Design an enzyme around this catalytic site. Structure first.
Site, short mmCIF file in Angstrom:
data_model
loop_
_atom_site.label_atom_id
_atom_site.label_comp_id
_atom_site.label_asym_id
_atom_site.label_seq_id
_atom_site.Cartn_x
_atom_site.Cartn_y
_atom_site.Cartn_z
N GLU D 65 119.77 106.96 72.79
CA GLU D 65 118.79 107.48 73.73
C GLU D 65 119.40 107.55 75.13
OE1 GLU D 65 114.82 108.23 73.41
OE2 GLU D 65 116.13 109.40 74.74
N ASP D 93 117.21 105.71 68.57
CA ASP D 93 117.47 105.21 69.92
C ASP D 93 118.78 104.44 70.02
OD1 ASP D 93 114.98 106.14 71.11
OD2 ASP D 93 113.99 104.56 69.95
N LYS D 119 105.14 105.91 63.17
CA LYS D 119 106.58 106.11 63.22
C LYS D 119 107.23 105.92 61.85
#
Ligand SMILES: C[C@H](C[C@@H](C[C@H](C[C@@H](C[C@@H](CCN1CCCC1=O)N1CCCC1=O)N1CCCC1=O)N1CCCC1=O)N1CCCC1=O)N1CCCC1=O
Ligand SMILES: C[C@H](C[C@@H](C[C@H](C[C@@H](C[C@@H](CCN1CCCC1=O)N1CCCC1=O)N1CCCC1=O)N1CCCC1=O)N1CCCC1=O)N1CCCC1=O
Ligand SMILES: C[C@H](C[C@@H](C[C@H](C[C@@H](C[C@@H](CCN1CCCC1=O)N1CCCC1=O)N1CCCC1=O)N1CCCC1=O)N1CCCC1=O)N1CCCC1=O
Ligand SMILES: C[C@H](C[C@@H](C[C@H](C[C@@H](C[C@@H](CCN1CCCC1=O)N1CCCC1=O)N1CCCC1=O)N1CCCC1=O)N1CCCC1=O)N1CCCC1=O
Ligand SMILES: C[C@H](C[C@@H](C[C@H](C[C@@H](C[C@@H](CCN1CCCC1=O)N1CCCC1=O)N1CCCC1=O)N1CCCC1=O)N1CCCC1=O)N1CCCC1=O
Ligand SMILES: C[C@H](C[C@@H](C[C@H](C[C@@H](C[C@@H](CCN1CCCC1=O)N1CCCC1=O)N1CCCC1=O)N1CCCC1=O)N1CCCC1=O)N1CCCC1=O
Ligand SMILES: C[C@H](C[C@@H](C[C@H](C[C@@H](C[C@@H](CCN1CCCC1=O)N1CCCC1=O)N1CCCC1=O)N1CCCC1=O)N1CCCC1=O)N1CCCC1=O
Ligand SMILES: C[C@H](C[C@@H](C[C@H](C[C@@H](C[C@@H](CCN1CCCC1=O)N1CCCC1=O)N1CCCC1=O)N1CCCC1=O)N1CCCC1=O)N1CCCC1=O
Ligand SMILES: COc1cc(CCNC(=O)c2[nH]c(-c3c(F)cccc3F)nc(=O)c2O)ccc1O
Ligand SMILES: COc1cc(CCNC(=O)c2[nH]c(-c3c(F)cccc3F)nc(=O)c2O)ccc1O
Ligand SMILES: COc1cc(CCNC(=O)c2[nH]c(-c3c(F)cccc3F)nc(=O)c2O)ccc1O
Ligand SMILES: COc1cc(CCNC(=O)c2[nH]c(-c3c(F)cccc3F)nc(=O)c2O)ccc1O
Ligand SMILES: COc1cc(CCNC(=O)c2[nH]c(-c3c(F)cccc3F)nc(=O)c2O)ccc1O
Ligand SMILES: COc1cc(CCNC(=O)c2[nH]c(-c3c(F)cccc3F)nc(=O)c2O)ccc1O
Ligand SMILES: COc1cc(CCNC(=O)c2[nH]c(-c3c(F)cccc3F)nc(=O)c2O)ccc1O
Ligand SMILES: [Mn+2]
Ligand SMILES: [Mn+2]
Ligand SMILES: [Mn+2]
Ligand SMILES: [Mn+2]
Ligand SMILES: [Mn+2]
Ligand SMILES: [Mn+2]
Ligand SMILES: [Mn+2]
Ligand SMILES: [Mn+2]
Ligand SMILES: [Mn+2]
Ligand SMILES: [Mn+2]
Ligand SMILES: [Mn+2]
Ligand SMILES: [Mn+2]
Ligand SMILES: [Mn+2]
Ligand SMILES: [Mn+2]
Lengths: 180, 180, 180, 180, 180, 180, 180, 180
Positions: D65, D93, D119
């Site tokens: 990320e 990420d 998620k």
């Protein structure tokens, strides 16, 4: 000599690594503006040597690669004259204070198998440890002793594969592979 | 006084170490431009003291060497008045918070054997720990307790032998050896 | 090669000037560790070129000396192709945007008289301005046009005489003078 | 668009985190001056990702990320092509070199329960590890494996609750909560 | 998209100028990785605007180019509302506090003649001053009022011709010229 | 108000610690130029709090002391609302993420015995941990749990005794002792 | 030796000026911890010399004061050997490249009248220019030629009167005045 | 106290100016978190004072505003005691070494006419120069002597109108205007 490879090398590697690879090539009668594939190789080998010493302890490794020829041999003599290891015939890359041995780091574009054998035939000193890295993600060390932890070595393989990807994105990988 | 030794000392050791050795010599009525061999000795002893404290933990060592005479004695009093160790007669180099003792660091050009005996006869306080380093790569500590790990000590020996090599390369080692 | 001259050069001139003179010598097949007198000359000539451009206005001078051979010739072409001055046969040191001419800076150990004539016979381009400095404090420019103000030039002469004094203090001036 | 939320975001988060969240939003066709609540969310998610990688070892985490879309996918390919983990469908990420898995970090304003399920349904790759943080102080990770030590995770929860407090002090929390 | 032009732009211009040209292009829906020729144009125009403001006095110029669209228009309003100049229809590049007028800086690959006429037809505000630079070394300003001194303008032409030379050395100039 | 104590405080403690103690005193209606003894106390207490947090792990301690009143209470709420510890009645100095408790650091000029009892009667929250340091070298913590290792605590005692020595050298210790 | 004057000197003057005045005093066999009034005088004289050279042009003044004895005399020889001014008998403070003369800067606590006469009798070289400053705000230069503009000199007088005020605020001015 | 004005002030003015305005307000018993409009006024007045001193020569202005009350009055005494100007009754903002007078800088939200008369009735010392700036772009100085050049003053007006625009964009200008 406006080479795409040279412009990519200067934007891919940090300026300090580029300056060291340029000094090393010019000393051995090589032009980085013309030998652009080798220019990418000296930078890659330099970075790998630096990340390798970044693994482990702070006082663990003595960095031999990256110095001028005379000073690198000076530190090699000092290490041999205080620890007792035999003076290697060829300049190594690092010295391991933890394991009391020199390390020869290799970065190859072929299979790690042929390169190590090529480096093992050159290094007459059987004491010197050999660690080979490939752009495919494979590695190979002497006596299966890979010195560092798995994750310090994993970071090096990931970086090597990113350099390959950026080279192939610019259509420069094929020339780089058929150049070693 | 254009001395080769002085110009080599200024290019061999970092500026901050050179400035400290110059302040220390001038305080004791010594000229670094004339006492050039001793100038190289104060720098070498200072660096070794700094690498020694760089080994071990962050809060492990209190550095006594390198301060002015009054402040160095001030920190010595504070260490004695909070831990309880006896006040040494002579200024030591470090204090070990891990082992609760002062350390006297020695750098010699002869055999580590005579120098330690010379320093053990001077240090009346048997509590103070003694650690001797040689330019040949030999070391010698009190009760065979070398305090640091082998690799922190190995880095110091390698550095000491590099200083010797650079001195001998400039034909300044012989005068330096026959000067202690 | 432990040369006193090399150690003095590294402590007399700033590191950035030393690094540039080393790159320039190695490019032309010269070793600064062996050609130590010339090593002192390239640094001295470089510094004088830098102080010279430090005189005058901020955008006044374009510095040609100190770059690699290819880039220095690139800036020379750009200056010729936008102003109109003829392309000089040999690489000059600066370009004066105020007076629209190239400047060849000279630093000599003999009389400024013979050196300028030596440089005036080499420079076929009569447009290129010549400015000679001596270690004795004498100067000499084309058409008596000394470009800079008296005090910027005075600072350069003072610096040149200090380098001489430090060289003579180390008994290195005599070899330096009988070397040009 | 003079938004209080935007001015608070710029004073609450460091400039480098703000610049990264602005580049990320503009790339996906979002205006931080208008989508001010999401602007606060990208910064918060970015910071949490940075503190998360600050926990553990130095070479432990690879930060995905915060990079541009193309380079983030380049590092993902290099990690998959050297370790062997399957290429995730969506950009994660981090990557854990210690546990050999990708990490999807979540920061939610509702209960950690619904967000993780949201998620977990999106991430088809069951290999990718999920770690959810809430502004209330609750956390939730895959297989109850929270990767980091309790105190690195505690620092993140404390920071998340401070952001909430500063938002509520400016009467901006209510809009932020009813915006996810 | 591994473009030689993009790698050359990143090594030719400073990182801060590259970052500004990237933000400016992305705001107007342009990709620097694909619109690589325009990428080189925004950087070149940005640098010229910065060197132009570097000429003259310290408080002389207000830099409008390089800011985001909203803030650049904010400074334009403040200049109009305190001096009294009419609000220009299009965003200019600078404002001259010495001459009390806006400046539109142009960098062209054709003759300065057609470009200025193209920019003079667009700029309805006859008050706004126009200054055109070419990669050949020619310049052209409104009412023959070139604002800066000859040498600040000469430095810009020299830089423009060096960019051309480096582009032609990499065989990228031809595409750049047949792209405006 | 030319006070010797104030000039000694400014030369004894680092500027950042001095600035924080000045902001803290002015907020509570105290003048550091007049309350010079307390000025030395706030700096000393601040430094001890900073060295204390310097011991242990990187993410181990959250520093409450040194912030403004409102923000210090904000971090206290966030710690209570994510871990679950009760909100203390008075502002503490640190929070231990390792042991999950607040720490009240004390620096006294009398015996550590009376001061702790004075601080234990004030702190109604029995959860908050108390750690007292003296200028004589004695320390005293809740349940004999001294949190840090012996050497981090030893460094604090040594520093406290050096401050005392410098104060007594300037004949300022007597007033400082008869001021608590 | 806990002297109020020494602590005030260290907080009144910048660290670099303090370090130079300490090196200068120790070289001439003076202790700044004991000769605290003179310690304040060397710092004050040093600062005035630095502000004086800060006036005028960039290349205007060569600073002689503040160097070690040998190097200061080296620069004096270089200035004499390139310009032609006679070698002064005593070390001056500056050299004026604009007016081609050495400058002796004086800072006195009495009337500027007696001090200049005292310095004019010592300086046999009538060429050396003398400029005296007082703590009351009066100044006095040779041939009424005050070298600098009125405002550079005004800044020095203002600074001198602020040092006096801070000294009198700490009740240290009276001893300082009755010490010259 | 979550005020939009406070968050805008912290993002509009540089941190050093914000810190100075906060110290100045707290000294006079004012809270920047509550007196948010005045907080914006102290920052604006501070910045204008700093840009004003940035105009003119380097040694031209002595900055009185921005210091603590005691030190600002100390510099005022030193200026009066070396030049001879009368001691002003109220603290001014600057001192002009070029014109030998104090300057009172004003920033108003009404017409420059009433504010100057308000400041001229307060300043009994007719020697002190008054210079008023408005957020509309109008200015007004004593005896029509505006001290600085037109462009240094123009930069200040442009900045003042940008602050107004940003305030009105956040709907904070109306409260700011109806607050003076
Ligand atoms: C010591 C110095 C240079 C060192 C080379 C090496 C570079 C190191 C820099 C580190 C910090 N990181 C990591 C993050 C970015 C960065 O910057 N890494 C490691 C990763 C890539 C990189 O760049 N290291 C290690 C000590 C400090 C330092 O810089 N070298 C050069 C050859 C010999 C040597 O020891 N020396 C020594 C004298 C000449 C010189 O230059
Ligand atoms: C604290 C400060 C100076 C310290 C001396 C010592 C020097 C240290 C610097 C480190 C960083 N490294 C390592 C890489 C290059 C570098 O720079 N090392 C160790 C190796 C050689 C070297 O240089 N350390 C340790 C703390 C930070 C610091 O600088 N000293 C001087 C004597 C007393 C003391 O503690 N102090 C204290 C007050 C006066 C002063 O100067
Ligand atoms: C631009 C940069 C280097 C410049 C060389 C030159 C050096 C300059 C440094 C100045 C600042 N001073 C003065 C005080 C100490 C210091 O540091 N001076 C002048 C006096 C001695 C010195 O050192 N200048 C001028 C611009 C900034 C700079 O550094 N050069 C090198 C050759 C070409 C060139 O323009 N470049 C350009 C690209 C490569 C590189 O390195
Ligand atoms: C590497 C670099 C940026 C890194 C982002 C990350 C930021 C890091 C900074 C650290 C130091 N701390 C901590 C104290 C304040 C500070 O400053 N932390 C962590 C906490 C908050 C923060 O800010 N790190 C980690 C390595 C060094 C660095 O800066 N990023 C950005 C995305 C990818 C990445 O690795 N890169 C890489 C190329 C582009 C770029 O910018
Ligand atoms: C102010 C700041 C950036 C400025 C842009 C401009 C860049 C300037 C940098 C100078 C120094 N030099 C010269 C040598 C190398 C260097 O670095 N030059 C001029 C030549 C090339 C270059 O780079 N200037 C001028 C003031 C300081 C500064 O940096 N800009 C960006 C657009 C608006 C603006 O005013 N700002 C303002 C807010 C956002 C930001 O970033
Ligand atoms: C974070 C920052 C300031 C921190 C205070 C603290 C100071 C720390 C500095 C370290 C580095 N060392 C050690 C060697 C010299 C030096 O400099 N030490 C510890 C020893 C003395 C000292 O000075 N730390 C810790 C993190 C980085 C930092 O600076 N503070 C202030 C109160 C709250 C807080 O966390 N903050 C936070 C926002 C405001 C501010 O200023
Ligand atoms: C050159 C260097 C030191 C110089 C002394 C002098 C100090 C100068 C610093 C300036 C910048 N300002 C002004 C604002 C704060 C600051 O910092 N000023 C002038 C005002 C007070 C001050 O401090 N100057 C001038 C050139 C750069 C420099 O620093 N000196 C010391 C004696 C000889 C000499 O030329 N040198 C030279 C070799 C040893 C050394 O240290
Ligand atoms: C001297 C120092 C602070 C000065 C204030 C002033 C700030 C100056 C900074 C300049 C550089 N620029 C301009 C570009 C960005 C930047 O940064 N400008 C002017 C514009 C805005 C700004 O910020 N100046 C001038 C000298 C150096 C300095 O910083 N002050 C504070 C009050 C008294 C004083 O003289 N001092 C003195 C002791 C305490 C302190 O802090
Ligand atoms: C003579 O060879 C050269 C070496 C260098 C500097 C690197 N010094 C090494 O000793 C070294 N060289 C290589 C290597 C190679 F053997 C062939 C091609 C590319 C390489 F990077 N691999 C290593 O691992 C290693 O340690 C610069 C220029 C040279 O021509
Ligand atoms: C009085 O001696 C001197 C000491 C110093 C500073 C070093 N302070 C020490 O206490 C010290 N000195 C020495 C030492 C020595 F004893 C003889 C010759 C050279 C040395 F480095 N070895 C140590 O290990 C040590 O700790 C500066 C100038 C002096 O003349
Ligand atoms: C081929 O010569 C060399 C040049 C260089 C770099 C300097 N480039 C110049 O062009 C130059 N050289 C010289 C010069 C010289 F001509 C003889 C001896 C010493 C000198 F410094 N004086 C100048 O003024 C000048 O501009 C490095 C190594 C070289 O061997
Ligand atoms: C397409 O979505 C956007 C993503 C980004 C950059 C963040 N990249 C992510 O992949 C990501 N996004 C989010 C997320 C979200 F899914 C919804 C709302 C807010 C969020 F922060 N949470 C994560 O944990 C995460 O890793 C910028 C602008 C976008 O519109
Ligand atoms: C209200 O008291 C004051 C507190 C402060 C800032 C310190 N904040 C504390 O909370 C604190 N104060 C003290 C303390 C004390 F209680 C008496 C005298 C001196 C001290 F340092 N010891 C601590 O350990 C501690 O944590 C500034 C000005 C104040 O007047
Ligand atoms: C021998 O004197 C000393 C000089 C110094 C360094 C200053 N070098 C000077 O040459 C110098 N000294 C003085 C001066 C003085 F003459 C008497 C008392 C105080 C002074 F500052 N005023 C000047 O203007 C000047 O240039 C350090 C220690 C010394 O004992
Ligand atoms: C007592 O007033 C205060 C002053 C300050 C610091 C500024 N020191 C001044 O002397 C000053 N104050 C003002 C001013 C004012 F008079 C009213 C409202 C806002 C202002 F900025 N305008 C100036 O031009 C000027 O020089 C901080 C807090 C105060 O309450
Ligand atoms: Mn190698
Ligand atoms: Mn190798
Ligand atoms: Mn010692
Ligand atoms: Mn010792
Ligand atoms: Mn040349
Ligand atoms: Mn030349
Ligand atoms: Mn993501
Ligand atoms: Mn995520
Ligand atoms: Mn334009
Ligand atoms: Mn507290
Ligand atoms: Mn406490
Ligand atoms: Mn003098
Ligand atoms: Mn004021
Ligand atoms: Mn005012």
């Amino acid at each position: 000599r406006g080479s795409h490879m040279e412009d990519f090398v200067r934007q891919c590697f940090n300026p300090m690594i580029v300056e060291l690879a340029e000094k090393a090539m010019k000393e051995y009668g090589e032009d980085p503006k013309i030998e652009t594939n080798k220019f990418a190789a000296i930078c890659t080998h330099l970075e790998v040597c630096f990340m390798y010493s970044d693994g482990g302890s702070k006082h663990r490794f003595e960095i031999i690669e990256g110095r001028d020829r005379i000073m690198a041999w000076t530190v090699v003599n000092s290490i041999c004259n205080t620890t007792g290891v035999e003076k290697p015939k060829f300049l190594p890359d690092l010295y391991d204070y933890k394991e009391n041995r020199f390390i020869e780091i290799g970065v190859t574009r072929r299979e790690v198998h042929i390169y190590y054998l090529e480096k093992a035939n050159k290094i007459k000193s059987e004491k010197t440890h050999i660690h080979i890295f490939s752009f495919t993600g494979e590695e190979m060390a002497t006596k299966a002793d890979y010195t560092l932890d798995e994750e310090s070595r994993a970071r090096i393989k990931t970086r090597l594969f990113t350099i390959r990807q950026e080279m192939a994105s610019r259509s420069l990988w094929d020339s780089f592979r058929q150049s070693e």
